[PDB]
Design a protein around this ligand. Structure first.
Ligand SMILES: [Mg+2]
Ligand SMILES: [Zn+2]
Lengths: 49, 53, 99, 49, 147, 147, 89, 1111
DNA sequence: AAAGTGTTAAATTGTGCTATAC
DNA sequence: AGCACAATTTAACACTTT
């Protein structure tokens, strides 16, 4: 998994910044941990998206 | 639930080939409105007189 | 120009199809309103699923079962009329009805 | 009329029932507006690709 | 002046709610509206009156017309919406995938209209590389060797 | 308006004789399959009924002509044949649509291409992909920006 | 009447059944409805074979012939974007 | 109050209420026992009017009888529909998968006229599905709920439009029946009339009026004012009866030979013969009340009479003149005004019984034209009716309604609240109603007539706002289908107690005061002017003599789920909507603690929802155990109540049911005797009480996320039990029979360790993703092996084993224990469908903890997923060392306008620790209007703030200043409500105080384990070879259109080409990429997508010569 | 003066579209 | 359901016979 980027996407994809590549790192649990600064670009809030 | 289905048939796994195949001969039939149709056949095969083209 | 259409695309032209073009694509005339058998669940002859016209249901086997291997390919079984070939050409051969 | 109470003092029955009018009309307009905007984005992408 | 009017009347609506969009995007959209002319008099070169032709092809057929008898086709510029311009495009495969698939497919077939696959909506359909970004020739025909 | 279609049939190598039909092509049977669901159930793909009705009324016309018939029965049969082929190509356009069991209209060949369900906006412009997943998101305030 | 009933035997099902099997299917259905009206309940296979002078192993085999194909192109849930063919592996 | 075993929950209510909350499930059950004709309804109809009450089934039989043919010599009559007893009991119906039913008996009677016959036979009509005690039906074992429907009532609707061309007003009418033809009387742009009948293009009035048989003097005589009518009588040109009849026939058919049958019988066969036009018993009330016809008459004639028709035209001609009143010959005068199509006096409610009645009517009408069909082909003397009757269409229509409809839905049960509010739901969509995309903005908004009938707050959030609502608390449904609402009438400024149930029509004729008005001990208002609601919805301020009605209570406008929010009037309506919609999605926990601060609606929404075992008659508990409670009544006999333990709900949640009485207790009638899923001591308990701080902590509670403590995982505070059901069936195939056995084709002996000797697993065996549950093996008939596999069989010596292996394995991502196995077999006479030898279901339990990604929510619309679960050592603790349990964010409070979640945070602290208002020298000024026994309270006391009459803002500030010390004398929370927290992670205190308190939070059913999906390679589709969709299959995430636009705008050509070819459609590229990845080579170039070659075939099958050219 | 008779405008019908993912 | 738009009619007109 090291240095193998993944594309993250959130519908609706309003502008071209709604698809962004990150590098991954294994995290215990079953929820994707998003960085708290890209949430403006995705327009994501953490109430169940 | 998932409900798998199949059109009745099979998929075989012989890797394809293109050099040794039993040999064939070509017949030619002629319909009523002057058309010509070429049909391959095996060599050990009785070539019939009439064919539904 | 390229009926197999494998990676060489320069244009793609549309147009009206004359009746000489429809009986040139086709591999035979379907003349019965039958789809499939009710007992043997095999496609009937000269119907909407007929092997003879559209292709073999099983890979490299004819209808009667006389030819069943890849050593015979391209040939047509003289007793049933089904060309022994792959079996996924049933999703690409056409057929026509004469009005 | 209008509503002379605040949300810290709490509203009365009639002022709350009056307020529900605009508070539901805004939600219905939000749904229909985000329905209409995607059609405009689609036409704008298609005319200018 | 119609460019000034369209840019100002769009940017007024976008400024009244506190949204900053630079004018070059609205100019890119507006440029795709004024691309065509309508025909007044046909001259004698294959142009039906009242038809909307591209400005470059019109000036090409008015360039050729000084040879073989001078009668220039006369046409005024037109301004048309995004649906009307998006539907009246060269590609027949890109216009059928958008709106009115039956009535686009049925008059592409009468005209025997061909496609050339140059936009990035038909290369998406047929599975080819789009002609933008790393898909154009000068970027994907790079040869790499060690110094 | 008439010069448009007359010049379309005049300019190219087209001919209007392709507007009336004499042979009807039949889509290959793997695009209108008959799938045996488990439990011994069968599912047909709704184009088989229209093809069956076309070849049914065609066989009945071919029998009525050889048998010798008055003009009323033959004209009624030809009108039924015309309505069957029109129901095959584009259902629900002229007259009332052909329904199956449940008073739902059958899906013709034209209904495979139109709409936001057509082959065009459903299976050509956007597809489902392998090697993908989805999940809920929570906040990650110790990560770097690229992680 | 013979022409109409023979046409309804021949060209009314997507899987074509011969007219003797359509005859025994009509006879089985009529006898089933009559015994239902006499009994006020649904009859049984071994009960149905008693009326029709056959084996009960024949009755369910006859009943598993008259099942008509369910159309692949109908919407299945209330969310109308899905059809049946999008759920068959 | 007035419940014998209730917990003593003190109330902050400053008012008393005259009318108590009704039997909340009376919208469902009272409409079914009208359809049956139970003696309860037979009494209760006579108890309020209704001189001759007729049942739901009697209304169909009395309008079908008598069956008479054209011969007129034989008649068939149905009468007296009675019911037999139920065949199976309730719980057994849910066990063996049979539906709750009862046989129907109807006395038939055949009378021949030529000789005289009376053989009146008793005919079994069918097995009619019965409604249970809780207002649910049981269909095929499962439990369904029939939902009410909102439709416009059939009648005469007037309207007025303004066209911008000539700037005048056009008044139109619409006479819309049920099952008939339409007719409108418009007024056109040029001065004319609009008499388009059955939607055909035009007519003038005088064509229809002289077609009706009216001379040209009477048109000028009755329509004498009528400046437009004589104008049309000049410009019409058609004179006579026949000359208009040919015009009507030629415009209506069109183009048919005019006869003398089609002249005088067509008009009487479209609006006057009661088989093609019948506006129902509602519509004949509406026209009689609108036009002011013979109201002093109990008319039952559902056909359009002629007189009303011409009265309609007069109404229109007095509307486009400027008028207020109109008197018709022989009736009372009426106001002249346009009607609203979305008023609640024009929007009736087809309840549960009327939908059943419509299905029975449309089934009997198929049954009707078989009877007179065999009234001719049979020979009399004698045909009993029985020969005559064939009940097969009626049972087919009933069975086709109860399943396969959109108005008979699966019961929404994952708590008692969603079960209660799935009934009492008023939906506008469905068959005969409007659509979801063809619905405008007019029906979605709240009309001002919704007060007391539909809740403005509770409605769905998606694309269904306004289309689905729920009934109020005190509402009630009229016999016609309108919605009533109680009011207290006030005479001479003195409020009496004569409670009148008004409808939405006659509410506007009076004026209605406000409930929180200062009544002074007799009925007199204190202030001389009262707040009041006028006719059009206006909010006036009127002196206290014109007031003639008052509300029976506050919270009257609000539903059942909305009335369980403390401090409702401090939240915005969007957040109150979300709070009412997030209470019916909470899961049942394993402990279910009652709320520390609530409203008064918890105790009544639990004993009426039916998920609580209630003692029937007053007895004394003889024997209690976790399965059963045998009580001994005062008169002889005993009664045993059987608790349902660990039953699966419809949505996977648990339905545990435990007693709360000991083995010597004395009970009373109606007393709660066993708790339910989400109940505690008989009242609703959806979540738990948790200590909350409102500080933002280190960016883990960032933008609506919630962080928790680890105490809730260690002590099982938010642990739920989820039960899944897996089903398999061995059928008869064309090659033999599928067998359920341990003998499985080629597989290890390690994966057969839990299966017993007859297939299925053992109860108690722990399974995981991939384990075999039911060992099932199907015959395969024949196929021939590859040469490599035939060599591999000959080496190791293993047979071919021609039977397949289709076992039942658990789906991907699930695990848990095994509760129960239910197996039905053909060999043991069980009821299974045709060609099914065996049918086995296996239930799997799973005890889910709380985890990050799960969705919690409060009562006030606040919500958010868990982003972090801190250990108990690094968590902000108080001065006691008590750590807090959740940490909510600050920045979500002020901008969402739901600060009621702060107020219950404050009161929840007081109710945690208890107050003592020291009135040692006098009661203080804030507590002047408090009740007694709120002056002091022991710790952990449950209080109750009702909805619009609760704790004021000036009394929370008083109770916060006396907040009795914990164990040592130590006040942990000062007067502002904030406390001084230490830092659990660094140690030093936070520099400023922080609001702490006790919030009531609920664990929603949006868990992470149901949402996470991944796919490398799975099943592909049939026609086009794209992957499937959804977690039930494997399915891939849809890379649609806007994602393609984003990747094109990036400039990434290769990722787009990879996502669109070798991941979806390139059929030879798919396995080539997999081979190249496994062997470790480079990914090959993509080919052509196999969904494009399908398009060329569907274009060539449209007769289009699509050809691809090279260069 | 009637009676058509063809050319020119308001009424009149039909076609197409209406967000995104689970 | 509506919003737009382009194709296809009642009717409104002067012009020319009768
Ligand atoms: Mg959100
Ligand atoms: Zn053969």
């Amino acid at each position: 998994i090291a240095e193998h980027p993944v594309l993250l996407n959130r519908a609706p994809t309003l502008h071209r910044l709604g698809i962004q590549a990150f590098e991954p790192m294994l995290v215990e649990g079953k929820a994707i941990q998003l960085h708290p600064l890209v949430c403006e670009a995705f327009n994501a809030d953490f109430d169940g998206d | 639930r998932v409900l798998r289905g199949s059109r009745l048939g099979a998929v075989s796994y012989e890797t394809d080939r293109n050099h040794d195949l039993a040999p064939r001969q070509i017949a030619r039939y002629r319909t009523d409105n002057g058309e010509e149709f070429e049909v391959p056949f095996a060599d050990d095969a009785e070539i019939p007189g009439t064919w539904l083209c | 120009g390229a009926m197999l259409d494998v990676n060489f695309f320069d244009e793609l032209r549309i147009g009206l199809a004359t009746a000489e073009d429809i009986r040139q694509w086709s591999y035979g005339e379907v003349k019965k309103p039958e789809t499939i058998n009710y007992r043997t669940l095999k496609p009937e002859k000269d119907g909407l699923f007929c092997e003879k016209i559209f292709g073999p249901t099983r890979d490299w086997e004819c209808y009667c079962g006389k030819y069943k291997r890849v050593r015979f390919k391209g040939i047509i079984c003289e007793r049933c009329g089904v060309e022994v070939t792959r079996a996924k050409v049933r999703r690409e051969r056409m057929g026509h009805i004469e009005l | 009329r209008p509503v002379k109470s605040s949300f810290r003092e709490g509203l009365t029955v009639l002022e709350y029932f009056i307020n529900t009018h605009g508070a539901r009309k805004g939600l219905a307009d939000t749904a229909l507006r985000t329905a209409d905007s995607g059609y405009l984005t689609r036409r704008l992408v298609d005319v200018s690709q | 002046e119609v460019q000034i009017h369209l840019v100002r009347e769009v940017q007024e609506v976008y400024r009244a709610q506190g949204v900053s969009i630079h004018d070059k995007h609205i100019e890119v959209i507006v440029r795709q509206m004024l691309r065509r002319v309508t025909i007044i008099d046909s001259g004698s070169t294959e142009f039906l009156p009242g038809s909307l032709i591209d400005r470059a092809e019109f000036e090409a057929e008015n360039r050729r017309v000084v040879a073989e008898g001078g009668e220039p086709a006369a046409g005024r510029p037109v301004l048309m919406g995004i649906t009307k311009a998006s539907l009246a495009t060269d590609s027949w495969l890109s216009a059928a995938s958008f709106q009115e698939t039956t009535r686009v497919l049925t008059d592409a077939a009468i005209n025997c209209r061909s496609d050339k696959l140059n936009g990035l909506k038909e290369n998406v359909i047929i599975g080819k590389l789009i002609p933008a970004g790393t898909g154009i020739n000068r970027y994907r025909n790079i040869a790499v060797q060690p110094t | 308006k008439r010069l448009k279609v007359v010049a379309a049939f005049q300019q190219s190598g087209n001919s209007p004789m392709g507007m009336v039909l004499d042979a009807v092509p039949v889509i290959p049977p793997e695009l209108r399959p008959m799938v045996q669901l488990d439990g011994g159930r069968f599912a047909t793909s709704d184009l088989n009924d229209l093809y069956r009705r076309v070849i049914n009324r065609n066989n009945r016309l071919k029998r009525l002509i050889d048998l010798g018939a008055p003009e009323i029965i033959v004209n009624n049969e030809k009108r039924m044949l015309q309505e069957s082929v029109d129901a095959l190509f584009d259902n629900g356009r002229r007259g009332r649509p052909v329904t199956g069991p449940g008073n739902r209209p059958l899906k013709s060949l034209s209904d495979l291409l139109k709409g936001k369900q057509g082959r065009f906006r459903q299976n050509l412009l956007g597809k489902r992909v392998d090697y993908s997943g989805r999940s809920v998101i929570v906040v990650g305030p110790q990560l770097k920006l690229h992680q | 009447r013979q022409a109409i009933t023979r046409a309804m035997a021949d060209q009314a099902r997507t899987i074509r059944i011969p007219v003797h099997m359509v005859e025994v299917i009509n006879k089985l259905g009529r006898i089933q409805r009559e015994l239902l009206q006499d009994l006020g309940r649904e009859p049984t296979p071994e009960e149905l074979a008693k009326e029709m002078d056959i084996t009960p192993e024949k009755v369910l085999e006859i009943q598993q012939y008259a099942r008509e194909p369910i159309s692949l192109d109908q919407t299945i849930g209330d969310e109308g974007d899905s059809q049946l063919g999008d759920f068959i592996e | 109050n007035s419940v014998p075993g209730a917990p003593n929950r003190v109330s902050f209510a400053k008012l008393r209420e005259p009318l108590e909350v009704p039997g909340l499930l009376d919208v469902q059950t009272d409409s079914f026992e009208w359809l049956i004709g139970s003696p309860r309804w037979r009494e209760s109809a006579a108890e309020r009017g209704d001189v001759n009450p007729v049942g739901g089934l009697e209304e169909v039989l009395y309008e079908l009888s008598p069956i008479e043919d054209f011969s007129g010599s034989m008649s068939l009559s149905f009468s007296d529909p009675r019911f037999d007893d139920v065949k199976a009991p309730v719980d057994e119906c849910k066990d063996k998968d049979m539906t709750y039913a009862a046989p129907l008996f109807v006395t038939a009677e055949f009378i021949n006229n030529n000789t005289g016959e009376i053989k009146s036979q008793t005919v079994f009509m069918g097995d009619f599905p019965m409604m249970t005690e809780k207002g649910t039906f049981i269909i095929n074992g499962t439990e369904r709920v029939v939902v009410s429907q909102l439709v416009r009532s059939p009648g005469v609707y007037f309207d007025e439009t303004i066209d911008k061309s000539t700037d005048k007003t056009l008044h139109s009418v619409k006479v819309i029946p049920s099952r008939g033809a339409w007719l409108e009387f418009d007024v056109d742009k040029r001065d004319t009339v609009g008499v388009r009948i059955d939607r055909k293009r035009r007519q003038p009035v005088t064509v229809l009026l002289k077609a009706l048989g009216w001379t040209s003097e009477q048109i000028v005589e009755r329509f004498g004012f009528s400046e437009i009518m004589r104008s049309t009588l000049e410009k019409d040109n058609t004179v006579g009866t026949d000359e208009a009849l040919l015009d009507i026939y030629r415009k209506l058919r069109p183009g048919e030979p005019p006869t003398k049958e089609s002249a005088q019988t067509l008009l009487e066969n479209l609006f006057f013969k009661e088989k093609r036009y019948d506006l129902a018993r509602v519509g004949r009330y509406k026209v009689n009340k609108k036009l002011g016809l013979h109201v002093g008459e109990p008319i039952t004639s559902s056909t359009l009479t002629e007189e009303d028709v011409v009265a309609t035209i007069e109404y229109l001609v007095r509307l486009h003149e400027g008028q207020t009143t109109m008197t018709v010959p022989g009736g009372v005068e009426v106001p002249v005004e346009t009607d609203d199509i979305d008023h609640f006096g024009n929007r009736r409610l087809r309840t549960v019984g009327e939908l059943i009645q419509n299905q029975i009517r449309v089934g009997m009408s198929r049954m009707e034209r078989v009877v007179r069909e065999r009234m001719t082909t049979q020979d009399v003397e004698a045909i009993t009716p029985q020969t005559l009757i064939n009940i097969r269409p009626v049972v087919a229509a009933i069975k086709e309604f109860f399943g396969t409809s959109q108005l008979s839905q699966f019961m929404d049960q994952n708590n008692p609240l969603s079960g209660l509010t799935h009934k009492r739901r008023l939906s506008a969509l469905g068959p005969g109603g409007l659509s979801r995309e063809r619905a405008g903005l007019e029906v979605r908004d709240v009309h001002p007539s919704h007060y007391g009938r539909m809740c403005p707050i509770e409605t769905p959030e998606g694309p269904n706002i306004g289309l689905i609502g729920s009934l109020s608390v005190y509402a009630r449904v009229n016999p016609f289908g309108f919605i009533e609402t109680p009011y207290r009438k006030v005479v001479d400024g003195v409020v009496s107690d004569e409670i009148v149930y008004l409808t939405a029509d006659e509410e506007d004729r009076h004026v209605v005061a406000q409930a929180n008005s200062p009544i002074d001990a007799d009925g007199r208002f204190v202030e001389p002017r009262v707040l009041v609601r006028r006719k059009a919805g206006e909010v006036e301020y009127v002196p206290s003599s014109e007031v003639d009605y008052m509300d029976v209570s506050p919270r009257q406008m609000v539903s059942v789920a909305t009335a369980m929010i403390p401090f409702l009037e401090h939240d915005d309506a969007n957040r109150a909507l979300m709070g009412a919609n997030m209470q019916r999605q909470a899961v049942p926990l394993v402990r279910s603690e009652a709320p520390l601060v609530g409203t008064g609606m918890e105790l009544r929404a639990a004993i009426d929802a039916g998920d609580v075992v209630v003692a029937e008659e007053s007895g004394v508990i003889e024997e209690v155990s976790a399965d059963y409670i045998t009580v001994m009544h005062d008169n002889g006999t005993r009664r045993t109540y059987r608790m349902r333990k660990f039953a699966r709900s419809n949505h996977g949640t648990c339905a545990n049911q435990c007693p709360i009485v000991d083995a010597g207790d004395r009970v009373e009638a109606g007393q709660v005797i066993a708790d339910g899923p989400c109940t505690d001591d008989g009242e609703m308990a959806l979540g738990k009480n948790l200590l909350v701080a409102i500080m933002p902590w280190e960016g883990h509670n960032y933008e609506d996320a919630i962080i928790l403590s680890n105490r809730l995982v260690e002590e099982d505070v938010l642990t739920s039990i989820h039960i899944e059901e897996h089903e398999i069936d061995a059928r008869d195939t064309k090659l033999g029979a599928e067998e359920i056995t341990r003998d499985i084709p080629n597989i290890s002996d390690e994966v057969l360790a839990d299966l017993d000797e007859r297939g299925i697993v053992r109860i108690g065996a722990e399974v995981r993703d991939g384990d075999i549950l039911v060992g099932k093996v199907t015959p395969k008939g024949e196929t021939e092996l590859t040469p490599e596999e035939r060599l591999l069989r000959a080496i190791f010596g293993e047979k071919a084993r021609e039977v397949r292996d289709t076992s039942l394995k658990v789906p991907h991502g699930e695990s848990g224990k095994v509760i129960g196995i239910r197996v039905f077999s053909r060999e043991d006479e069980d009821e299974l469908p045709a060609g099914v030898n065996e049918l086995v279901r296996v239930y799997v339990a799973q005890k889910r903890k709380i985890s990050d990604g799960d969705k919690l929510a409060g009562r006030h619309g606040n919500k958010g997923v868990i982003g972090k679960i801190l250990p108990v050592e690094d968590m902000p603790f108080l001065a006691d060392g008590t750590p807090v349990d959740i940490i909510l964010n600050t920045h979500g409070v002020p901008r969402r306008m739901n600060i009621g979640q702060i107020l219950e945070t404050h009161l929840g602290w007081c109710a945690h620790s208890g107050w003592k208002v020291d009135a040692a020298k006098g009661v203080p000024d804030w507590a002047a209007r408090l009740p007694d026994e709120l002056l002091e309270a022991q710790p952990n006391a449950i209080v109750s703030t009702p909805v619009f009459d609760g704790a004021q803002e000036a009394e929370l500030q008083g109770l916060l200043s006396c907040t009795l010390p914990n164990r040592d004398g130590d006040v942990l929370v000062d007067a502002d409500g904030k406390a001084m927290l230490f830092d659990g992670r660094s140690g030093e205190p936070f520099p400023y105080p922080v609001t702490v308190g006790y919030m009531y939070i609920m664990k929603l059913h949006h868990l992470v384990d149901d949402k996470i999906h991944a796919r490398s390679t799975g099943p592909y589709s049939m026609i086009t070879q794209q992957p499937l969709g959804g977690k039930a299959q494997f399915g891939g995430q849809r890379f649609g259109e806007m994602e393609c636009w984003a990747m094109q705008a990036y400039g990434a050509a290769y990722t787009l080409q990879e996502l669109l070819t070798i991941k979806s459609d390139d059929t030879v590229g798919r396995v080539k990429v997999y081979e190249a990845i496994v062997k470790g080579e480079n990914i090959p170039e993509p080919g052509i997508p196999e969904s494009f070659k399908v398009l060329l075939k569907e274009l060539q099958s449209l007769c289009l010569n699509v050809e691809v050219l090279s260069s």
